[PDB]
Design a binder for this molecule. Structure first.
Ligand SMILES: O=C(O)CCCCCCCCCCCCCCCO
Ligand SMILES: O=C(O)CCCCCCCCCCCCCCCO
Lengths: 269, 269
């Protein structure tokens, strides 16, 4: 249902996303090999990849993640890490929008994600800029799981059209803002967004449509169960703003589903 | 390296042992279906399987677990929970031995595992007897992960030779006593102990040999990595008390490895 290649790409960014949680970063000097505990990120481990800059609890958002250089794959990787405790993060998730004309006109994004990104937008733009300067040939990728996937998405929309493509690969991300904004993300050039989801994962169903939120298209939806390995025939491309039939179906959502994207993610053995 | 039938049984009781941590409520009334959060136990869900008795913080050692009827697979299963926090359990772990001539001539066993079991033995022996009566054709199986594996193993050594075979399936169990006990467990009749280990899991390496502890023979050792699905080709039987070159190797040991036996175990998504 997707190609081998694009699968491998989904697999690799799910691990950079998992490494945001299970990596040895911070108290990590720049230039360090990236490794994870608990077999969280073996594809990232097999590559020649190293931190370019680590951040922890940065800004009003208390944002955490890392910029990586991968010379094996010729990436620059911005990987945001979701919440340290997802269930609490879901419980306290506030649904307020706020205006974001900076990125698109008439676009409203989750005030909270957009606020948190804003607060670190300058620093991280610079670092990504440095890294694009040093390696002009490298693909720039932003990625993340859960609240991480949200950040990568907001950051990515914010920083496109500035000379380099930015590809975004998000895993179980929540909705990030209103319909205008969903439309922006569906068509905005200068990068592709790959919005990945799994079975009845709860996180992509928040905030709810009823509070003003809409989902960009397309959606890449993993059919295979929680703790079950994913094959190419287990991922289905679902076209259409707010399409139903992928993750957005009328059943009871699930938190374990959220923690299984190709492998264990958002928690560390 | 092991038969398919045998690989099916390991997988199954690895799920019953995981159910001891993830199966929904220990206030579950007698006779209710067995289910788990997070896809921890789908081979158990798929069977007609029900609780016979549920215990929690029972006796002086706070033992937790259940007895179960599996009308599909024709089993009575006593499954013991390991520790709710393994990492502390490891570090708080005392190495004192105690005489156990009650079960075994010249046998010394771990003091807490041994007292814990003694202290709930009479109750649970009852409960199992009642079941053998009712389903005389059913295989009795005791099982357990981590501390729970050690409990199943002590219970198994202690309640054999009373008419009905006890098979025992232990997953990441530490050492349970001295050389003598090790030999008893290797040759005792009235059932088979199946002592499963995974890669470089630390729990089967504790207490140390240098503390007077020995492991029964054989061992079944899963060589596939953490988070890797297991096939019957990934398990190796190692013969000989204290054999090395299965889990008992001099390399650096690991905790994530202890939480992956056929699938997630010892922790609940
Ligand atoms: O609506 C909002 O603004 C967000 C509400 C949810 C708050 C719940 C707290 C969750 C606790 C976990 C803290 C880890 C966050 C790390 C962020 C890394 O980018
Ligand atoms: O040497 C000993 O006596 C054992 C030492 C380890 C003590 C750590 C306490 C365990 C805390 C978590 C509670 C789970 C125990 C439940 C046992 C179920 O069979």
């Amino acid at each position: 249902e997707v190609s081998q290649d694009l699968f491998n790409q989904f697999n690799l960014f799910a691990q950079y996303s998992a490494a945001a949680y299970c990596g040895k970063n911070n108290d990590a000097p720049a230039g360090t090999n990236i490794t994870c505990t608990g077999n969280a990120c073996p594809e990232v481990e097999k590559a020649d990849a190293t931190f370019l800059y680590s951040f922890e609890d940065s800004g009003v958002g208390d944002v955490t993640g890392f910029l990586a250089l991968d010379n094996t794959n010729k990436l620059i990787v911005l990987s945001f890490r979701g919440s340290r405790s997802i269930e609490n993060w879901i419980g306290n998730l506030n649904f307020d929008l706020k205006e974001i004309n900076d990125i698109c006109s008439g676009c409203r994004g989750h005030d909270g994600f957009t606020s948190s990104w804003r607060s670190v937008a300058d620093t991280l733009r610079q670092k990504v800029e440095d890294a694009v300067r040093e390696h002009p040939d490298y693909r720039v990728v932003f990625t993340g799981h859960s609240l991480g996937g949200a950040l990568a998405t907001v950051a990515g929309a914010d920083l496109r059209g500035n000379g380099y493509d930015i590809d975004v690969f998000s895993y179980g991300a929540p909705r990030v803002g209103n319909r205008a904004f969903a439309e922006f993300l569906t068509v905005q050039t200068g990068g592709t967004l790959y919005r990945i989801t799994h079975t009845n994962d709860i996180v992509p169903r928040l905030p709810p449509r009823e509070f003003g939120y809409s989902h960009s298209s397309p959606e890449y939806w993993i059919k295979s169960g929680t703790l079950v390995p994913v094959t190419r025939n287990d991922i289905v491309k679902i076209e259409g703003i707010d399409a139903t039939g992928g993750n957005n179906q009328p059943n009871i959502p699930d938190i374990p589903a959220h923690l299984w994207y190709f492998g264990l993610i958002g928690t560390c053995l």
